[PDB]
Amino acid sequence: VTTTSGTGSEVTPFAVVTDDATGQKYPLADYALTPDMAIVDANLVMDMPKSLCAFGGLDAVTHAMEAYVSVLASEFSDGQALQALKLLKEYLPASYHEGSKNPVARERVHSAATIAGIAFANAFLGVCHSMAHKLGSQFHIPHGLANAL
Amino acid sequence: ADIVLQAAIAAGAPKDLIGWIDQPSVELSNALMHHPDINLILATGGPGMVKAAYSSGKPAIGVGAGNTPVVIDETADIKRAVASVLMSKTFDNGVICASEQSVVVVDSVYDAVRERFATHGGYLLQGKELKAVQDVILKNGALNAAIVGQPAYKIAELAGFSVPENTKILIGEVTVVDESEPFAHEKLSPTLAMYRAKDFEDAVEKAEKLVAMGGIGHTSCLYTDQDNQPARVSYFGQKMKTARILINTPASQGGLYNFKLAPSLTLGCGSWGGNSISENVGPKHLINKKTVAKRAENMLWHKLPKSIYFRRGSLPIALDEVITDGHKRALIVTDRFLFNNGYADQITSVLKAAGVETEVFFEVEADPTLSIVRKGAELANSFKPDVIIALGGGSPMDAAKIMWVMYEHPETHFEELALRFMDIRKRIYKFPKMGVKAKMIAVTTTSGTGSEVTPFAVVTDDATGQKYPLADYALTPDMAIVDANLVMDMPKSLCAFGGLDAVTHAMEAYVSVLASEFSDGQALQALKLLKEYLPASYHEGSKNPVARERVHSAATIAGIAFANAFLGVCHSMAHKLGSQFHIPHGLANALLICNVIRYNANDNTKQTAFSQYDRPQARRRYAEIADHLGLSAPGDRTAAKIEKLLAWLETLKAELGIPKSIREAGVQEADFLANVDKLSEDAFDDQCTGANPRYPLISELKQILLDTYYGRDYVE
Amino acid sequence: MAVTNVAELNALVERVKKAQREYASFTQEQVDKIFRAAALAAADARIPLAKMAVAESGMGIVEDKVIKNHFASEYIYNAYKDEKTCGVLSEDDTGTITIAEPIGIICGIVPTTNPTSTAIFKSLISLKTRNAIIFSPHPRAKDATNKAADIVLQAAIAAGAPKDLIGWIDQPSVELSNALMHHPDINLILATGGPGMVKAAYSSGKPAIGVGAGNTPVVIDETADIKRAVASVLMSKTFDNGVICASEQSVVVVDSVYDAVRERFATHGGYLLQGKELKAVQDVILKNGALNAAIVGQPAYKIAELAGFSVPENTKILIGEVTVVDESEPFAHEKLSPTLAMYRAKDFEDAVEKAEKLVAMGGIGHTSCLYTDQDNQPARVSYFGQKMKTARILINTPASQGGLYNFKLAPSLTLGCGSWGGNSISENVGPKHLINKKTVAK
């Protein structure tokens, strides 16, 4: 069950853990870790501030902008990556200035975060999401900023 | 009543909550029943006022009492049953309702109970005094009130014959049972009626008339040995029509009797007519329950097979995974044409090398007829497979899903699934769980049908010729192989046959009312590449391998979308045409797609509350295709924007090699006008019309079929 | 063989008696098998029967009767599929057995409104509870009901059922149907239709239940959606020309949004009228003392020609503007035609009061709908349900059904009561009113 709009971690088989004594990452990836049922609800994202809708949404934009250009892109995922970018270019601005006062835009943005999740579950992320994965861990900046600048 | 009132008054109740009448009269009580402020009557007593209670124009229930018969046979305990009835009739002078009123005994033991009764508490009478008591109970054609509840001895003084003080009850010996005999009616006095039975069988018959004479069946009790004669008690219950069937048990109660029995009263009925069984009145007959319903928003879904594999030569590698996993037994479902070719060794040989038991199923033809699927299930449960691998596109892959259900649930009849699961829009009934002892692998052989990814199955019955569609998200295969090396030599006359089927498969799911943001991108990606090298896959076939591979993966992409959003009406007359003209599917929806689009963009009788305000429109959704596919001027109008889309659809047929109208597609005028009416109002009911936002009418589903016959273009 | 008068009815009923006597011994095993085959033939024979259900009736349209026949034929084999109605029902050790027994021959009146939708519903619950029915349809729609009953019969015949288990009368008459109700061999009556014969069914000295229809009011206040409630009611009243029982019969709107609806209705599908033709419309539905049979199920435009004034073809329904609510004005009674009544409310509070009188006028409370915002005004919906007396409370929901609406709702019919009026609430008739359970005690 997803309570954030912008990270597609409910449909993808990716998980990262850190060591206790030391600090190097322990990434894991096996199609078998995908949940056998994912619930995408929008009423769980209604009052989160205009400082998490702006970083999750950009995280979703980054999640799909390079899955279309990744070397692992097939004719099965460019149909979904090209849709999230189309969907977020007309609802993310409307879900930031107006916030919950426009509930249709929030639902569209939340639903299109999982679509990018489908896109990057099969194709894999580029260098933009790897350097951003470390630069957001040493300087303790949230995930969503690092791939935005 | 006042005691209960005052108890309730000092507990929080209003002051005049219970009322009663003083010095009542028949005229005063009548005004109470006809009062328009009273909406229930609880009537108790004999058929003196309960009969009038029913004929009052108001809902009423009556706690009546019918003469309960007692049956004692030769196998019963005589010494014990004589006294259980004896004490139950002397309880409150036998006034408690639904008490004993008659005893029926066989001739084998009749003499035994006669002197026993006179010995313990009875006093029999047979002379002139016998026809004295009967005249006492009935005086004016109705029961008198001068002997109700009185002890037995005093009522004998009324008739003039002395009876000793110690005597408990008085009993007559009467054979004729009717109205003129007054000893069968309810008496509410310590008296009993004794009846002559020649055997057990007539005893029950002689008890049927007694219950029927009381009008309402309340209780029945017979005394018998319940341990060595268990059939007699079972026979006794299916013949008497009463709410209670007691054995070796007093009717009302004792003075260690059974404690969890409802009282004789609190058992009412709602009719004075015959064959009426009483029921226990409780705080449900005096209560009315209302139900509210809230308009709950509907949620969509996106359900797909767990794994989909696709590339040039992806069958052996995907098949290998199955070998590595534990899978010993597997069967392959196939058609006829491909087996005589080298299209079956490329899957069996790779299986035999690893070593697994595979069998041949080569009898499925173009349309499954419920006869070969049954024999397939018969072969399935005679082999106990662990993996079901489908082969072929369309017919042999749809039938494999039904074989899977019938193999995993042999007890469930097919005709039970014909009314529960026929449309994927309801979610209140669940399929029995599947995949317990098998799993489905789906492989395609033709480019342009995504049936390996959808939860759809259509079964024809060869007896009459009726289709039984099945649809639920449990028949979806657990794996789909999309390989292209097996399509390098398909005839150019058929590569595009299914190719245009996918065009209508994707174009129709985009404008469906169930279309969501999840299935819109895939429905659009399929159309985008089909104008790029699908015609190349037609003219080249083998001169351009890559185009055929690219088109083949698009059929699943078209199918991956409509498996979540049902097709519209175009895929309905397509079903109907392809099953009576024997034309193949793919052609049927090809030459009327250029005529059903215009019947979806106009003013138009439309279904309301959906596809009118919830969804934007259908005319502008087709407008997105013309600009998504890039065939629109920078500045143009929507009305003219669809025109160029239809123009592209027409001029692609100039090299697609498809007929211009249905008549030129190999059908005759003679066998159309006499069959169009029969053909029209069945496409209206093939689980379509969920999509195609416009609500169709039979009057407007024929002009389409008549307009396409002569090649004429529809216009109003 | 055909039956002409009482002389052959008094022999037809004996055959059904003899078949019922033998059929009562069947067990649960082959009773469900007969249930399966009967439900299939009802669903598989929906279109043909609906085409010939309007050829002689002359009212309604074929399109909407297909769904009505299909929904009613599959809903019965959807919740009563597997429940113990034969043999032993339960067992209490305490030895307490609770076997159940059927009732017997059942009478049934099929109205001209739904000659086949309710004919197959009644026929499909009796053979589930091991009893038999005799049908007495209207002379206008006799041939449609008889065919529907015969289809289920022949389906059950080739499943293990006795020969003469379901009967019907040809060329029926009022005097012939009276002899069927007073027959001492029938112990249940299922009466349906308007208050024309159900009143006589109650006054018959026999147990009887009636699937009636009260004029259901719809309440729309100022806070409700105005562009959505106009259409949900509009499509639910044009369903089969508004003959579906317990459909909309009157709308009550507050003064705030009255004119906001008046132009909308004329814009979309309505045609308002206020002149002398309003009197004509009132008189065109009363031939004498009650509702006439010449405008039942007819489209809106033709009845206007009979009423005198011309109305365009495209128009869907016609609606009057009447303030008085009594008997003299006939616009409050059930009409079974694509017509609606529009009422004046000064506020929401009087709207519910103006709806109490409408429900009480129908005699039996069946359904009542309110259109309001259910998310920021939750007190109003709670208040609305404790004031009316109806079996169903619907908010933001069409009365009968749609053409992705709610699926787990019982049909408008299969909801009967046991009294005419006096604040009576209907209930869903099912395979428990036709069964009697006996208890044995050891």
Author numbering:
A (entry chain C): 595 to 743
B (entry chain B): 150 to 404, 408 to 756, 758 to 869
C (entry chain A): 1 to 94, 96 to 404, 408 to 446
What does the original paper state about this entry?
Here we present structural convergent evolution on fusion enzymes of aldehyde dehydrogenases (ALDHs) and alcohol dehydrogenases (ADHs). We discover BdhE (bifunctional dehydrogenase E), an enzyme clade that emerged independently from the previously known AdhE family through distinct gene fusion events. AdhE and BdhE show shared enzymatic activities and non-overlapping phylogenetic distribution, suggesting common functions in different species. Intriguingly, despite distinct quaternary structures and < 30% amino acid sequence identity, both enzymes forms resemble dimeric structure units by ALDH-ADH interactions via convergently elongated loop structures.
